[PDB]
Design an enzyme around this catalytic site. Structure first.
Site, PDB file in Angstrom:
ATOM      1  N   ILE A   2       3.340  -5.368   0.765  1.00 23.46           N
ATOM      2  CA  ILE A   2       2.083  -4.851   1.307  1.00 23.46           C
ATOM      3  C   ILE A   2       1.175  -6.040   1.725  1.00 23.46           C
ATOM      4  CG2 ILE A   2      -0.051  -3.649   0.605  1.00 23.46           C
ATOM      5  CD1 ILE A   2       1.646  -1.634  -0.959  1.00 23.46           C
TER       6      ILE A   2
ATOM      7  N   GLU B 130      -0.276 -10.460   0.419  1.00 22.38           N
ATOM      8  CA  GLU B 130      -0.240 -11.621  -0.510  1.00 22.38           C
ATOM      9  C   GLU B 130      -1.665 -11.947  -0.964  1.00 22.38           C
ATOM     10  OE1 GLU B 130       2.471 -15.023   0.101  1.00 22.38           O
ATOM     11  OE2 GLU B 130       3.311 -13.892   1.785  1.00 22.38           O
ATOM     12  N   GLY B 131      -1.855 -12.166  -2.266  1.00 20.06           N
ATOM     13  CA  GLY B 131      -3.183 -12.534  -2.791  1.00 20.06           C
ATOM     14  C   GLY B 131      -3.125 -13.823  -3.588  1.00 20.06           C
ATOM     15  N   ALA B 132      -4.280 -14.333  -4.017  1.00 19.00           N
ATOM     16  CA  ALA B 132      -4.302 -15.540  -4.874  1.00 19.00           C
ATOM     17  C   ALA B 132      -3.828 -15.166  -6.281  1.00 19.00           C
ATOM     18  CB  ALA B 132      -5.693 -16.117  -4.903  1.00 19.00           C
TER      19      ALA B 132
ATOM     20  N   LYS C 227       1.727 -11.385  -5.276  1.00 18.31           N
ATOM     21  CA  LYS C 227       2.163 -10.565  -4.118  1.00 18.31           C
ATOM     22  C   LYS C 227       1.866  -9.097  -4.418  1.00 18.31           C
ATOM     23  CE  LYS C 227       5.762 -13.189  -1.622  1.00 18.31           C
ATOM     24  NZ  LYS C 227       5.422 -12.712  -0.261  1.00 18.31           N
ATOM     25  N   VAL C 228       1.678  -8.299  -3.372  1.00 17.88           N
ATOM     26  CA  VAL C 228       1.430  -6.880  -3.543  1.00 17.88           C
ATOM     27  C   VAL C 228       2.652  -6.193  -2.952  1.00 17.88           C
ATOM     28  CG1 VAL C 228      -0.171  -4.966  -3.167  1.00 17.88           C
ATOM     29  CG2 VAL C 228      -1.040  -7.305  -3.221  1.00 17.88           C
TER      30      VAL C 228
ATOM     31  N   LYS D  22       0.694  -4.925  -8.063  1.00 19.27           N
ATOM     32  CA  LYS D  22       0.089  -6.265  -7.860  1.00 19.27           C
ATOM     33  C   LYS D  22       0.375  -7.118  -9.097  1.00 19.27           C
ATOM     34  CE  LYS D  22      -3.733  -7.290  -5.759  1.00 19.27           C
ATOM     35  NZ  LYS D  22      -5.145  -7.294  -5.312  1.00 19.27           N
TER      36      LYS D  22
ATOM     37  N   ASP E 293     -15.665  -8.345  -1.249  1.00 16.53           N
ATOM     38  CA  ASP E 293     -14.817  -8.495  -0.037  1.00 16.53           C
ATOM     39  C   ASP E 293     -14.534  -7.118   0.570  1.00 16.53           C
ATOM     40  OD1 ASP E 293     -13.436  -9.681   1.993  1.00 16.53           O
ATOM     41  OD2 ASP E 293     -11.747 -10.372   0.767  1.00 16.53           O
TER      42      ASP E 293
HETATM   43  C1  LIG Z   1      -3.305  -5.079   1.503  1.00 18.78           C
HETATM   44  C2  LIG Z   1      -4.580  -5.459   0.764  1.00 18.78           C
HETATM   45  C3  LIG Z   1      -5.757  -4.558   1.113  1.00 18.78           C
HETATM   46  N1  LIG Z   1      -4.361  -5.518  -0.698  1.00 18.78           N
HETATM   47  C4  LIG Z   1      -4.438  -6.613  -1.528  1.00 18.78           C
HETATM   48  C5  LIG Z   1      -4.657  -8.072  -1.094  1.00 18.78           C
HETATM   49  C6  LIG Z   1      -4.877  -9.054  -2.241  1.00 18.78           C
HETATM   50  C7  LIG Z   1      -3.492  -8.521  -0.220  1.00 18.78           C
HETATM   51  O1  LIG Z   1      -5.843  -8.144  -0.294  1.00 18.78           O
HETATM   52  N2  LIG Z   1      -4.288  -6.307  -2.800  1.00 18.78           N
HETATM   53  C8  LIG Z   1      -4.088  -4.931  -2.810  1.00 18.78           C
HETATM   54  C9  LIG Z   1      -3.807  -4.044  -3.820  1.00 18.78           C
HETATM   55  F1  LIG Z   1      -3.880  -4.485  -5.093  1.00 18.78           F
HETATM   56  C10 LIG Z   1      -3.508  -2.725  -3.589  1.00 18.78           C
HETATM   57  C11 LIG Z   1      -3.532  -2.228  -2.283  1.00 18.78           C
HETATM   58  C12 LIG Z   1      -3.215  -0.803  -1.996  1.00 18.78           C
HETATM   59  N3  LIG Z   1      -2.595  -0.594  -0.821  1.00 18.78           N
HETATM   60  C13 LIG Z   1      -2.142   0.658  -0.599  1.00 18.78           C
HETATM   61  N4  LIG Z   1      -1.475   0.891   0.553  1.00 18.78           N
HETATM   62  C14 LIG Z   1      -1.329  -0.040   1.657  1.00 18.78           C
HETATM   63  C15 LIG Z   1      -2.621  -0.164   2.465  1.00 18.78           C
HETATM   64  C16 LIG Z   1      -2.374  -1.037   3.674  1.00 18.78           C
HETATM   65  O2  LIG Z   1      -1.271  -0.549   4.457  1.00 18.78           O
HETATM   66  C17 LIG Z   1      -0.045  -0.606   3.704  1.00 18.78           C
HETATM   67  C18 LIG Z   1      -0.171   0.379   2.557  1.00 18.78           C
HETATM   68  O3  LIG Z   1       1.061   0.435   1.835  1.00 18.78           O
HETATM   69  N5  LIG Z   1      -2.264   1.709  -1.421  1.00 18.78           N
HETATM   70  C19 LIG Z   1      -2.915   1.480  -2.564  1.00 18.78           C
HETATM   71  C20 LIG Z   1      -3.430   0.238  -2.891  1.00 18.78           C
HETATM   72 CL1  LIG Z   1      -4.414   0.078  -4.308  1.00 18.78          CL
HETATM   73  C21 LIG Z   1      -3.854  -3.087  -1.233  1.00 18.78           C
HETATM   74  C22 LIG Z   1      -4.116  -4.419  -1.519  1.00 18.78           C
END
Ligand SMILES: CC(C)n1c(C(C)(C)O)nc2c(F)cc(-c3nc(N[C@@H]4CCOC[C@H]4O)ncc3Cl)cc21
EC number: 2.7.11.22
Length: 263
Positions: free
Chosen positions: A9, A11-13, A16-17, A33, A120
């Site tokens: 999904i 990459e964060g600090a 990976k997600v 995450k 953010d």
């Molecule tokens: C991507 C970003 C906003 N993100 C980051 C980072 C650190 C990278 O910014 N951490 C993230 C995290 F912990 C969770 C999610 C999240 N995402 C989805 N679905 C996604 C939404 C985007 O389209 C593809 C779908 O599969 N559902 C539920 C959750 Cl909670 C997104 C996160």
């Protein structure tokens, strides 16, 4: 294992997600995450588990926390960006913009009521459900400045009003379907902001910061209807109260919830 990663999904600090299958829960999709290795992070996870106890409708659900640390969240298929990309012409219906803004302010008021600041907030972390439900994600843990508040750019204060500026930016973008302030650096970002809202009074400029008020000559403030074309009279007023330079004079999520725009 209990989870099976199917796609990345993001990459964060430092982590990976991943979109994963919850094998023990009907193979439901989950967002996993992984947080690398402290006590501050222990507190951060404790706050997230506590916020989950309230199970707020406008915040992503935290299904599980495993021990370096794996955070299991509900999976939502789309973010506000993908929703705004795919919405047909002439854009988001007026009442869909209204409802989504109320839900965002409800989740925001919930976090602020529990002394949590997103810091953010951007359409990429604002998730939209198949039912049209706004869910806040990606907050509570420790580049695009298009939504960054002026006091964050100036490096003076980092309180809750920071998120309300991002909401004003997002509110504008729901009509425009393109960001309001697309700067390329902190100084460019602030300049692009002051071109629209005008230079604030000297009393509204943060004291003891590196950038002075005289480093900008944006002169007068322009009408917002020019940059946000289809906004109503009441929407214009709520948008202006969010995009206030002075964070102490900026509307809060709680008083935004009561604004006549939602009556
Ligand atoms: C991507 C970003 C906003 N993100 C980051 C980072 C650190 C990278 O910014 N951490 C993230 C995290 F912990 C969770 C999610 C999240 N995402 C989805 N679905 C996604 C939404 C985007 O389209 C593809 C779908 O599969 N559902 C539920 C959750 Cl909670 C997104 C996160």
């Amino acid at each position: 294992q209990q989870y099976e990663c199917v796609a990345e999904i993001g990459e964060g600090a430092y982590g990976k997600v991943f979109k994963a299958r919850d094998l023990k829960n009907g193979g439901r999709f989950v967002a996993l995450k992984r947080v690398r290795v402290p006590l501050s992070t222990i507190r951060e996870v404790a706050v997230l588990r506590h916020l989950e106890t309230f199970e707020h409708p406008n915040v992503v659900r935290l299904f599980d926390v495993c021990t370096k640390l794996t955070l299991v969240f509900e999976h939502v298929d789309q973010d506000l960006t993908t929703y705004l990309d795919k919405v047909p012409e002439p854009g988001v219906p007026t009442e869909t913009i209204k409802d989504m803004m109320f839900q965002l302010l409800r989740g925001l008021d919930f976090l602020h009521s529990h002394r949590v600041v997103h810091r953010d907030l951007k359409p990429q972390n604002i998730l939209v459900t198949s039912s049209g439900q706004i869910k806040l994600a990606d907050f509570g843990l420790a580049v695009t400045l298009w939504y960054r508040a002026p006091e964050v750019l100036l490096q003076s204060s980092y309180a809750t009003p920071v998120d309300l500026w991002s909401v004003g930016c997002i509110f504008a973008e729901m009509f425009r379907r393109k960001p309001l302030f697309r700067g390329s650096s902190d100084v460019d970002q602030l300049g692009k902001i002051l071109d629209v809202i005008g230079l604030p009074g000297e009393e509204d400029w943060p004291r003891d910061v590196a950038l002075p008020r005289q480093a900008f000559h944006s002169k007068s403030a322009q009408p917002i209807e020019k940059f946000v074309t289809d906004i109503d009279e009441l929407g214009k007023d709520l948008l202006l109260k969010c995009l206030t330079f002075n964070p102490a004079k900026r509307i809060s999520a709680y008083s935004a919830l009561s604004h006549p725009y939602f009556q």
